[PDB]
Amino acid sequence: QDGRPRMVDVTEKPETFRTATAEAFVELTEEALSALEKGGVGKGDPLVVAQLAGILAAKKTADLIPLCHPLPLTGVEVRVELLKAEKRVRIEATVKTKAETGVEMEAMTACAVAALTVYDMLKAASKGLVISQVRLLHKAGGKSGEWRR
Amino acid sequence: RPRMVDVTEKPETFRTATAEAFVELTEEALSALEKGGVGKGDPLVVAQLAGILAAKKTADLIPLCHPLPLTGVEVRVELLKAEKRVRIEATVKTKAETGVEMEAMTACAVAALTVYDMLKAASKGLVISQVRLLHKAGGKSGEWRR
Amino acid sequence: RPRMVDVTEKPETFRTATAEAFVELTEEALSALEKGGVGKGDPLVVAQLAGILAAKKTADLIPLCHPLPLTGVEVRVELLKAEKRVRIEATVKTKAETGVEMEAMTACAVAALTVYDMLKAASKGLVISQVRLLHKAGGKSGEWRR
Amino acid sequence: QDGRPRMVDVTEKPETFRTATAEAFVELTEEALSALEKGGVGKGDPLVVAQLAGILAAKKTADLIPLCHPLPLTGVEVRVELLKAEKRVRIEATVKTKAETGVEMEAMTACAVAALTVYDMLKAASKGLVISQVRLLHKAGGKSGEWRR
Amino acid sequence: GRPRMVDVTEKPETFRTATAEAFVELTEEALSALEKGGVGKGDPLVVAQLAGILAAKKTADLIPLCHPLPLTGVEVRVELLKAEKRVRIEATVKTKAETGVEMEAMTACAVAALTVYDMLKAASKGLVISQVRLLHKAGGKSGEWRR
Amino acid sequence: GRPRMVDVTEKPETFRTATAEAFVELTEEALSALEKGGVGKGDPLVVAQLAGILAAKKTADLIPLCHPLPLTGVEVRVELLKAEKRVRIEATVKTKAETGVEMEAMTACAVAALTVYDMLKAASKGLVISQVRLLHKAGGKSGEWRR
Ligand SMILES: Nc1nc2c(ncn2[C@@H]2O[C@H](COP(=O)(O)OP(=O)(O)OP(=O)(O)O)[C@@H](O)[C@H]2O)c(=O)[nH]1
Ligand SMILES: Nc1nc2c(ncn2[C@@H]2O[C@H](COP(=O)(O)OP(=O)(O)OP(=O)(O)O)[C@@H](O)[C@H]2O)c(=O)[nH]1
Ligand SMILES: Nc1nc2c(ncn2[C@@H]2O[C@H](COP(=O)(O)OP(=O)(O)OP(=O)(O)O)[C@@H](O)[C@H]2O)c(=O)[nH]1
Ligand SMILES: Nc1nc2c(ncn2[C@@H]2O[C@H](COP(=O)(O)OP(=O)(O)OP(=O)(O)O)[C@@H](O)[C@H]2O)c(=O)[nH]1
Ligand SMILES: Nc1nc2c(ncn2[C@@H]2O[C@H](COP(=O)(O)OP(=O)(O)OP(=O)(O)O)[C@@H](O)[C@H]2O)c(=O)[nH]1
Numbered sequence: 023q024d025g026r027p028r029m030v031d032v033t034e035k036p037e038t039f040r041t042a043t044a045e046a047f048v049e050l051t052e053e054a055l056s057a058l059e060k061g062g063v064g065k066g067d068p069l070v071v072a073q074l075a076g077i078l079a080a081k082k083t084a085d086l087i088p089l090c091h092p093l094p095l096t097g098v099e100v101r102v103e104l105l106k107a108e109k110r111v112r113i114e115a116t117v118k119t120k121a122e123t124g125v126e127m128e129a130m131t132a133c134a135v136a137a138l139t140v141y142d143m144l145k146a147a148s149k150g151l152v153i154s155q156v157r158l159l160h161k162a163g164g165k166s167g168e169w170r171r
Numbered sequence: 172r173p174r175m176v177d178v179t180e181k182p183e184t185f186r187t188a189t190a191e192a193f194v195e196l197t198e199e200a201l202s203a204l205e206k207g208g209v210g211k212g213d214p215l216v217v218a219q220l221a222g223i224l225a226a227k228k229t230a231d232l233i234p235l236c237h238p239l240p241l242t243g244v245e246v247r248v249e250l251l252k253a254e255k256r257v258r259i260e261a262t263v264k265t266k267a268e269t270g271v272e273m274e275a276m277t278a279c280a281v282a283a284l285t286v287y288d289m290l291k292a293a294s295k296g297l298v299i300s301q302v303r304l305l306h307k308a309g310g311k312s313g314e315w316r317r
Numbered sequence: 318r319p320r321m322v323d324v325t326e327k328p329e330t331f332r333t334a335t336a337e338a339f340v341e342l343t344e345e346a347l348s349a350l351e352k353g354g355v356g357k358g359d360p361l362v363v364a365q366l367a368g369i370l371a372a373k374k375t376a377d378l379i380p381l382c383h384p385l386p387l388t389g390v391e392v393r394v395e396l397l398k399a400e401k402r403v404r405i406e407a408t409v410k411t412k413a414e415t416g417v418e419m420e421a422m423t424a425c426a427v428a429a430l431t432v433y434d435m436l437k438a439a440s441k442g443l444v445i446s447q448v449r450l451l452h453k454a455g456g457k458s459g460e461w462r463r
Numbered sequence: 464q465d466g467r468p469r470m471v472d473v474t475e476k477p478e479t480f481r482t483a484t485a486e487a488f489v490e491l492t493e494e495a496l497s498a499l500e501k502g503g504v505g506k507g508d509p510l511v512v513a514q515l516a517g518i519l520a521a522k523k524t525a526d527l528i529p530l531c532h533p534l535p536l537t538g539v540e541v542r543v544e545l546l547k548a549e550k551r552v553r554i555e556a557t558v559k560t561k562a563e564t565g566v567e568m569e570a571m572t573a574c575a576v577a578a579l580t581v582y583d584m585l586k587a588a589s590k591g592l593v594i595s596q597v598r599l600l601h602k603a604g605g606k607s608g609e610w611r612r
Numbered sequence: 613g614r615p616r617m618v619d620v621t622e623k624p625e626t627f628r629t630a631t632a633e634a635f636v637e638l639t640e641e642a643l644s645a646l647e648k649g650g651v652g653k654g655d656p657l658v659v660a661q662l663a664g665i666l667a668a669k670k671t672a673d674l675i676p677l678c679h680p681l682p683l684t685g686v687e688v689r690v691e692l693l694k695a696e697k698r699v700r701i702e703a704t705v706k707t708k709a710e711t712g713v714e715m716e717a718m719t720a721c722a723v724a725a726l727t728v729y730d731m732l733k734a735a736s737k738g739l740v741i742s743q744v745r746l747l748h749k750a751g752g753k754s755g756e757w758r759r
Numbered sequence: 760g761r762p763r764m765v766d767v768t769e770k771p772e773t774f775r776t777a778t779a780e781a782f783v784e785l786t787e788e789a790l791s792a793l794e795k796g797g798v799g800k801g802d803p804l805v806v807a808q809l810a811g812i813l814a815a816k817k818t819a820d821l822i823p824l825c826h827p828l829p830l831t832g833v834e835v836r837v838e839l840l841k842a843e844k845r846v847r848i849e850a851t852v853k854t855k856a857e858t859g860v861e862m863e864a865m866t867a868c869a870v871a872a873l874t875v876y877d878m879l880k881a882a883s884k885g886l887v888i889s890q891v892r893l894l895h896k897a898g899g900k901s902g903e904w905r906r
């Protein structure tokens with residue numbers, strides 16, 4: 023019984039309210055930005071589709087992250103705004119639940135997939151786009167307690 | 172209006188894509204990682220496999236993305252001690268009417284998310300940064316690089 | 318803005334939902350079905366199982382739908398010769414902050430789609446009609462019926 | 464080797480261009496209609512979300528329909544309009560591909576799930592809503608050839 | 613030494629085929645339940661035969677380094693062998709691609725077996741899935757292979 | 760007689776646990792490949808052990824009448840037994856719910872085995888998955904059960 027892959031046993035940990043908020047950014051290029059403001063490259067609105075994709079991702083997290091716990095989610099929010107001046111798209115997501123485990127991954131993942139979704143909705147205009155700074159901003163509940171960046 | 176771009180008209184040509192991602196480590200992260208993980212298993216070994224799997228699940232995560240038959244997938248996950256970084260690279264190949272830039276980008280992203288998952292117990296200040304396309308080729312498009 | 322409705326605040330109460338669907342048959346469909354299918358297997362046996370499975374996959378099909386632990390699923394698939402109809406009914410139960418009307422509606426819909434798949438070789442004029450909620454109960458909501 | 468469930472062998476059938484178009488309707492009630500025109504019951508725009516859900520469904524078809532063939536899809540279109548006067552929401556989808564098998568199910572399924580999605584986006588306003596007349600409108604390619612309702 | 617999905621880009625898409633089987637040893641209690649039609653959960657074999665077909669289609673999702681594949685065909689047969697008190701599962705999967713379908717056929721049986729077990733464990737938790745093996749395969753380089 | 764997901768609504772959510780194992784018979788060629796680190800696809804056991812964990816989480820998706828479940832824990836161990844020329848797989852799954860986790864544990868091993876097979880079939884297509892059985896289970900009504 024060495025240090026090998028395993029899903030930590032949290033059977034005896036209580037069922038407390040958990041939450042987590044994350045964010046991701048997408049660095050745009052002129053062409054990219056030009057298209058976005060024109061409504062996309064013909065596939066639909068990048069932000070609208072990516073926003074829904076980010077929510078769906080939150081629900082598929084345990085399917086993408088190997089040692090992650092399957093959890094019923096009680097809430098999922100996702101914001102996908104365009105920071106016109108900075109040439110950036112900003113995604114932020116907040117997930118909530120009632121289980122023995124946290125939801126930092128459901129939050130982190132929601133942001134990464136919505137980021138990938140914006141990329142797919144605009145790579146035809148420019149493939150140099152970059153997804154940057156995907157990071158956690160807060161979480162609460164359980165034992166660790168509150169946390170903010 | 173949203174929609175999956177019709178490509179029935181185009182032919183099956185070889186397609187290849189290569190991307191990469193970075194996870195910025197905190198000493199607390201790098202120390203755990205080096206001692207074998209935070210107690211959940213080698214963070215990198217798990218990230219790499221999760222990356223190959225993410226490439227296979229791409230079309231089910233990216234809404235307008237085209238379902239394709241992956242013909243090859245490589246994923247590299249390496250620790251850069253001096254840089255306090257985890258570098259991830261993925262190459263996806265296929266034969267179809269569309270590129271695999273998503274599969275590659277997705278493989279890197281999810282691998283990164285897995286590095287985060289295997290180390291966040293040591294630090295939640297970990298940052299996934301620069302998931303970007305390095306190389307791509309095939310069909311009409313042609314060559315392209317960072 | 319789209320979003321999965323926060324219910325962390327509410328308690329886990331028993332929840333139940335019952336829906337149904339109909340597939341209008343053409344003589345060409347009913348004749349195949351009665352002879353055992355169009356050659357792919359009992360259309361109804363397959364529809365019923367597909368329905369139970371659809372109930373389990375609901376949250377992955379309905380975007381804002383809440384992930385829940387299903388605690389029970391019943392699906393009935395019956396031929397109504399005189400009516401040239403296929404009647405489908407599904408009841409889903411659970412214990413959580415939200416109802417299972419989707420699971421039940423989804424179970425019926427997909428079962429219906431399966432009846433169509435097992436018979437369309439005989440007729441593509443088959444119609445899925447009236448997928449609707451029959452009964453529902455649990456928590457704040459209370460009773461409700463067609 | 465009797466008449467039991469099986470995925471028909473189409474290995475020796477050629478790879479021809481296939482297409483299929485289907486449609487589904489959702490009968491609304493006043494409350495339902497009132498909310499839809501007001502932008503939904505708080506979860507987002509029913510038509511916008513259902514439209515994306517219908518596309519995604521098209522890709523999960525083989526996962527929902529037991530004896531259905533796994534196929535690379537080459538195209539997917541979905542229309543989700545509100546027929547204000549008839550108190551109906553009309554969904555229509557068209558799928559395309561290049562394989563030995565048709566895509567009538569990818570089309571039928573896209574419509575049924577988008578219908579379910581509109582239901583979920585409005586059941587809070589009225590649960591009496593009904594999904595009706597999900598049917599095929601056309602298909603082409605392969606052997607059967609053209610077909611229209 | 614690291615894991616990966618083998619590059620088969622330059623290989624030609626041909627007719628591939630694989631056939632594997634699986635066995636489920638039945639205890640007397642479980643066999644009796646099977647003959648009565650199951651523990652009231654449903655018909656063990658009927659449900660299992662379907663689980664195998666669906667299974668085969670989810671193969672690439674369960675085997676990490678497996679290649680995703682459009683399947684041209686899937687055949688599954690689940691039978692009872694009273695005398696040996698065993699359930700037998702045979703599956704033949706067919707495709708046109710650069711890689712074989714041994715995994716789809718192999719997984720088809722394993723999961724079908726797992727389903728027999730689920731449908732009867734209420735009677736005997738000790739039931740065993742005894743033999744999941746490849747019987748035949750064909751297509752491409754190595755050509756026809758037989759057990 | 761029709762199939763269905765058994766109603767367990769009125770049962771209490773308790774600590775459930777199940778442990779099952781699986782074996783993979785190795786031919787001399789395959790064993791040799793295993794000791795060298797595999798056929799160049801990656802480390803058979805490492806990859807398999809992960810496939811089992813993921814597998815267990817996809818259980819409800821593969822077994823038709825199975826109950827979906829939040830899993831509190833999943834343990835998988837994959838070892839080589841040179842002398843018997845066998846790979847052994849043990850999996851223990853844990854949850855808090857109205858139903859047992861025998862399927863999650865049972866499927867964890869079967870799929871892990873299927874993965875060993877995938878990682879080594881290049882060397883020997885004849886490798887066999889010989890024994891997938893339940894070793895222990897606990898929680899609820901029947902309580903502790905042992906092979
Ligand atoms: N400006 C420009 N637009 C393009 C080009 N190719 C396609 N488009 C537009 O963008 C859409 C295609 O999106 P892409 O991301 O390039 O390809 P895709 O196959 O749709 O998406 P994936 O399956 O995720 O790879 C088309 O329907 C057009 O609306 C191009 O070369 N230049
Ligand atoms: N260094 C360190 N390790 C911890 C700490 N808390 C838990 N661990 C270790 O890491 C494991 C928990 O991993 P987490 O990612 O925090 O939680 P998890 O539920 O296992 O993982 P998720 O389901 O992905 O959220 C424990 O079983 C220990 O092995 C901590 O505060 N510091
Ligand atoms: N008018 C009205 N609106 C409600 C009621 N309950 C919830 N809502 C609104 O509708 C949203 C909830 O949608 P519902 O479909 O009822 O429940 P849900 O859990 O979000 O959706 P499912 O997980 O698919 O069952 C809330 O966020 C509010 O915006 C209600 O009782 N009356
Ligand atoms: N009565 C009748 N049966 C047909 C016809 N064509 C095919 N069949 C039978 O039905 C099977 C084909 O089913 P289809 O649904 O048309 O095609 P499929 O590829 O098997 O099914 P999908 O993947 O869901 O599209 C054949 O293998 C025969 O068993 C037809 O024109 N009339
Ligand atoms: N010794 C031996 N090695 C082989 C043979 N064929 C392929 N290999 C090696 O094993 C790898 C191929 O693995 P396989 O499992 O046969 O095929 P695969 O397509 O990669 O795997 P699947 O998609 O799961 O079928 C090659 O990249 C080589 O490293 C063979 O016939 N004999």
Ligand SMILES: Nc1nc2c(ncn2[C@@H]2O[C@H](COP(=O)(O)OP(=O)(O)OP(=O)(O)O)[C@@H](O)[C@H]2O)c(=O)[nH]1
Pocket residue numbers: 651652653730733734735764765766767822824825826858859860861862901
């Ligand atoms: N003979 C016998 N039958 C049982 C027992 N427990 C349950 N049953 C019967 O089998 C059904 C339960 O099936 P199980 O497989 O034990 O449990 P399950 O939760 O339905 O199935 P899973 O979700 O796959 O674990 C009940 O509805 C009864 O029909 C038992 O202990 N002995």
